Specification:
Two copies of one chain form a homodimer. By secondary structure, the first copy, chain A, is mainly alpha-helical. The first copy, chain A, has nine helices and two strands, in the order H-H-H-E-E-H-H-H-H-H-H. In chain A, strands 1-2 form a two-stranded antiparallel ribbon. In chain A, strand 1 and strand 2 form a beta hairpin. In chain A, helix 3 crosses helix 5, helix 3 crosses helix 9 and helix 7 crosses helix 8. At the A-B interface, helix 5, helix 7 and helix 8 of A face helix 5, helix 7 and helix 8 of B. The complex binds estradiol (2 copies).
Chain lengths: ~250, ~250
């Protein structure tokens, strides 16, 4: 019984849409040459800035703040990259063959070749973008999916069985069911038949497994550069996630 | 129009069930000590033997042989490990805390600690097994899911856009929709309401994203041992997949 399981389909949608994060710009001098900037440095700087905003977004996803601090952290540490990728793919949907990492930063596959291992990832992201185009993915659907990833990605890795942990997983699976009801709701409204509904649902959810795959590939690349000497992501997340209530 | 898109739910189920592969045994001398055998050597030998049988299984999955040789190969090269894992998890469903890799080879997490990186994977597989138990996963559902993985895992990585390739992807997405219809069918029969249906469907499909994750982790481990000097999996698959029609 909470301000999460009570909501109706349209309430969840509105909640998710209003919670959407902003679209950041790549930080580079626009009046200066380009073959000067570090593509990676740019992508990394952008991701880091977006993370800060991803936290605000998560806290506004119905049911998320009802969880424990550490559970909230685990889920984000597990899904952060997939969340960034789906957003990226969503933005690029209307730019065939390009990835709109930022309004002032559109890259085609050729531009991903200046870095080892990056070209493969760019092609998977582009292919995902085309898939969405093909499916005519809607913004209402996009938000549900992105919220689904936040909750589902790290739910199978809680290396705990305490009573509290069982109550936590139950809650998560309950919220996910509500998001499922919403997606179906959004489809019935649209005019899709019942068959087309369960079919579109499957099609969308199965894309999530490819997004997971892209994150793993991305984690591999990321983890090959940085070294075991940097505040482990867990902590940064914890610091930003464990906020006080002073700036009332 | 083919012996695939024509079938009815019960026909697909029967097809999938009758096509099930056999349960192989680990090859080791049962009358000899155990701390003697190579855990990895055993797991690798088993997987290799199962692959041979996975090919026969795939060829019997409705719609699979209508695809081109190379497409059939790509899909298997992409999903083989996930297929082995789901099967493994399915077998272990009635053995809390253990992984029944084979009837004569049951291992708990302690036994996975004799090898670097393996303990993490054992825990993800065990957690998946528990999840299925919890969901009371049915054998009819299991086969649909395993078939879904075969078709969905590598469909987003066909680095081709020829007309033939578009016709190939269309076919795959059409078969997948049929498997979706089957799953729903299997649930309505069971007595689940329409809400519980789309909800159970979501729950099952979302598990597939975790199975993908386990494969990536497994591929990382596998790829860290063997060396770039072994008949690349593509070829073994091609050889076994490109069969003649002489043993009529
Ligand atoms: C993490 C990487 C840099 C940042 C990239 C990014 C940065 C911002 C964003 O919104 C999405 C993505 C998706 C792919 C990410 C890349 C995968 C490999 C690279 O290390
Ligand atoms: C591929 C590995 C050996 C074979 C293992 C196996 C072997 C047979 C099988 O039916 C399932 C699995 C799942 C995990 C696999 C392992 C993941 C890491 C290891 O290299």
């Amino acid at each position: 019984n909470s301000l999460a399981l009570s909501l109706t389909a349209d309430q969840m949608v509105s909640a998710l849409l209003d919670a959407e994060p902003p679209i950041l710009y790549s930080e580079y001098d626009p009046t200066r040459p380009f073959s000067e900037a570090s593509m990676m440095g740019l992508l990394t700087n952008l991701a880091d800035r977006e993370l800060v905003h991803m936290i605000n977004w998560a806290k506004r996803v119905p049911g998320f703040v009802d969880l424990t601090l550490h559970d909230q952290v685990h889920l984000l540490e597990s899904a952060w990259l997939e969340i960034l990728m789906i957003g990226l793919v969503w933005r690029s949907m209307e730019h065939p063959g390009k990835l709109l990492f930022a309004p002032n930063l559109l890259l085609d596959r050729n531009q991903g070749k200046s870095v080892e291992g990056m070209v493969e990832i760019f092609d998977m992201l582009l292919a995902t973008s085309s898939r969405f185009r093909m499916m005519n993915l809607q913004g209402e659907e996009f938000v549900c999916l992105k919220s689904i990833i936040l909750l589902n990605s790290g739910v199978y890795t809680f290396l705990s069985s305490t009573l509290k942990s069982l109550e936590e997983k139950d809650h998560i699976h309950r919220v996910l069911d509500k998001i499922t009801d919403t997606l179906i709701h959004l489809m019935a409204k649209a005019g899709l038949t019942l068959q087309q509904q369960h079919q579109r649902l499957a099609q969308l959810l199965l894309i999530l497994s490819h997004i997971r795959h892209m994150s793993n590939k991305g984690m591999e690349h990321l983890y090959s550069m940085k070294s075991k000497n940097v505040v482990p992501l867990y902590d940064l997340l914890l610091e930003m996630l464990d906020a006080h209530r002073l700036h009332a």
